[PDB]
């Protein structure tokens, strides 16, 4: 099959070791560089027609921090490549004692399509860098970056290692019957399962980056201005179809209506009075996922916002007000452009709510007692945590990131990526000289 | 069931918060250390039992190895718990970013037979000091082990956190339907894909050290009395059943006489003229890998050895010479004290054979030359790798112990342990103060574009 061979060359070009001297990966990387410089136009129109980007937010939520990875990866890649000594006994003196960092093989990375050239590209870089083949699946239902990165990175990289597949899920499925020697699956918690359900019958590791419902915790003495507008970019952009949206609110009833009127007055700073109307507002992704949403809204009170266009897949800004946690839009990811407000009485019982669901990928909270946002740390559990601001937390190369339970397992981004894609062996070099100090570890034993 | 409720109790008793701090870790692991020292003669007679393994090599071949973690692994404790500060960027200079570190909540160790206080404990040191509720599987094989652990685990660490689930494989199939957060297993590479998949099913992480054939090149120019000395004791500690004894010889066919000659210098002065004398010299664990193991010689040209006593499953210390690498013994990981030497006209013929085959969980190589050390290292993979010695680098607080490909994902020991069996946290905590820098990034977006 296409799938097969395509996987045969890279395999076979990996095992030629091409991908060993770190020069060659740098010029991979460079290449990837000069891609997005020369393909900027083309990819904002990809990101447009998918997601309804603009010229700015394709470059300033998404393609910059690609381009940031690259240019750090470069510039470290000598120095994270290198042996590691570690630290000796009085036993080991005389050794060599050191982790050495090799590839794994061939990777294949599963892009979604909520930033589909960020979740591809991103983790490519990284499985680059480590020496790795590596093959790309980008979703379908970002059809246009798909058809897009087919194109262009052959066009830009090697043509044998890093292949770029087609297809949806069916080709998906073929595809993971392929051995590989590390999958990263960026989607749902569900899909996650299969994924690691393939990867189980050729023993490959995985890095999984999968879903939940990120809360978000507001406490009750704090300043809801800067939170609120704060809350409301990182909910709305991308017409709220990302992975670490705060998801919903947790607040004390006595603020609820303070929080509707900011989030309220933020909204239409950012989009106007008729959202429909401003470049910088998205569009939910297909026709499925608007109904979805859109059902979400039913039975629910909303406080601002609640109309759809199902043509172009439109939903305006939405805050619902409290909201019954059985109910359906406290049930599911969101996903879109869809706020509810669940009211709890104390910290102790949000942190109660957070703990009774599944680990979230984000957990955020603003307070200004930093007693408080340490409390709630301290007692919950998620892949990363942001207080007093939402999403940065996972543009930072210092801060690995990935989810924890249904939320996903291992991580990447910076230095971690660049361990994720390698196998650390622990090397011991001792000298081929008689040493009496082993002659004990010898039998016979004494008595 | 009994599996259901044992799961259920350490669930809730680590929901009580009764883990978290570092007092009540430590408080176990000094159980532990206490288990050790009071059971000591109760451990030695259950590894006679199984293995026949003496006092001295009961300790020094394994009890040693987890006392040595927990006492570490105490020292460590607060300064690998702490939160940990990363490096800041000037968008980020004004708040704090770190990385904090919490427990998964209910690990299952799956323990082996052939080190069965070692793999079961071990893990479990780890497990404790990063904070979760463990429950341990040992492996049925070694009974004697498995029944005694059954009973003194209780005796010294708390009863609802840290259970032992008795029984076989019908046992660990019915435990591995029950909700875990990391499975940690040791053992075969077949099984660690039934642990995988098993563990899909609620999106558990998994530790698994598993098998292959750790192979062992000679290097022609090399001081064959002492490199056969250290293989030999390698190779035949624990009648052979290491997980990473150096399972073959890869050599020159100049030297194979001399590497004959010297292995069998070196098991005279370990066990004698006759092995089965020894009280040094172990016992294949039971009648069905005897039988596996004796039909490993068949067929083959024997140096040294060859024979075995089904009765005590005694097997003589073997050498097997210009080994076909088709023929059965070079084909499964041999797991006893059969030694086969494969036949190799260089070190580059060395490399090909070695990444022809599954990725082994050690890779070993005797040679007073660094070139053909460091060209070994670069051109193969492994799990780990030893240069002029066998085994003493899965022993090491800092060297992590785990495979890759076939012999396993994730890894273990010294602080390895407790970042396995945690979950490390990316923290952002900025002030809640109007910051100018951050109006950038607010829509409405500039309606010109500038130069990047
Ligand atoms: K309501
Ligand atoms: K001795
Ligand atoms: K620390
Ligand atoms: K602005």
């Given at each position: ?124 870089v990284g499985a680059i860098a480590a020496g790795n083949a590596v093959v790309l699946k980008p979703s379908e239902l970002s ?26 899920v069916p080709e998906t499925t073929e595809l993971l019957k392929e051995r590989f020697d590390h999958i990263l699956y960026t ?261």
């Open positions: 099959s296409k799938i097969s061979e395509a996987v045969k060359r890279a395999r076979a070009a990996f095992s030629s070791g091409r991908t060993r001297p770190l020069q060659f990966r740098i010029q991979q990387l460079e290449a990837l560089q000069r891609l997005i410089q020369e393909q900027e136009q083309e990819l904002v129109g990809a990101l447009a027609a998918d997601l309804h980007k603009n010229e700015w937010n394709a470059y300033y939520e998404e393609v910059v921090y690609v381009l940031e990875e690259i240019e750090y990866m470069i510039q470290k890649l000598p120095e994270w490549a290198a042996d590691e000594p570690v630290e000796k006994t009085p036993q080991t003196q005389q050794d060599e004692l050191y982790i050495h960092s090799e590839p794994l093989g061939v990777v294949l990375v599963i892009g979604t399509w909520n930033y589909p050239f960020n979740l591809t590209i991103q983790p490519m059809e246009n970056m798909a058809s897009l990165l087919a194109t262009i990175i052959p066009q830009y990289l090697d043509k044998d290692l890093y292949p770029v597949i087609n297809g949806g989607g749902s918690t569900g899909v996650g399962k299969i994924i690691m359900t393939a990867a189980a019958k050729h023993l490959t590791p995985v890095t999984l980056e999968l879903g939940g419902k990120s809360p978000c915790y507001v406490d009750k003495n704090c300043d809801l201005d800067v939170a609120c507008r704060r809350i409301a970019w990182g909910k709305f952009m991308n017409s709220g179809q990302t992975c670490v949206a705060p998801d919903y609110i947790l607040c004390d009833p006595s603020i609820q209506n303070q929080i509707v009127e900011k989030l309220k007055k933020s909204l239409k700073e950012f989009y106007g009075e008729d959202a429909k109307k401003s470049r910088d507002y998205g569009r939910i992704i297909s026709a499925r996922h608007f109904q979805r949403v859109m059902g979400l809204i039913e039975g629910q009170k909303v406080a601002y916002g609640g109309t759809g266009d199902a043509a172009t897949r439109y939903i305006a800004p939405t805050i619902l007000t409290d909201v019954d946690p059985q109910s359906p839009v406290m049930q599911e990811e969101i996903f879109g452009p869809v706020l509810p407000i669940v009211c709890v009485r104390s910290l102790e019982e949000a942190i109660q709510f957070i703990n009774q669901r599944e680990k979230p990928l984000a957990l955020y909270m603003f307070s200004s007692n930093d007693k408080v946002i340490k409390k709630m740390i301290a007692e919950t559990s998620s892949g990363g945590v942001a207080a007093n601001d939402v999403i940065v937390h996972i543009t930072l190369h210092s801060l690995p990131f990935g989810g924890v339970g249904n939320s996903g397992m291992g991580s990447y981004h910076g230095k971690k990526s660049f361990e994720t894609f390698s196998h650390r062996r622990s090397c011991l070099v001792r000298p081929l000289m008689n040493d009496e100090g082993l002659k004990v570890r010898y039998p016979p034993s004494p008595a």
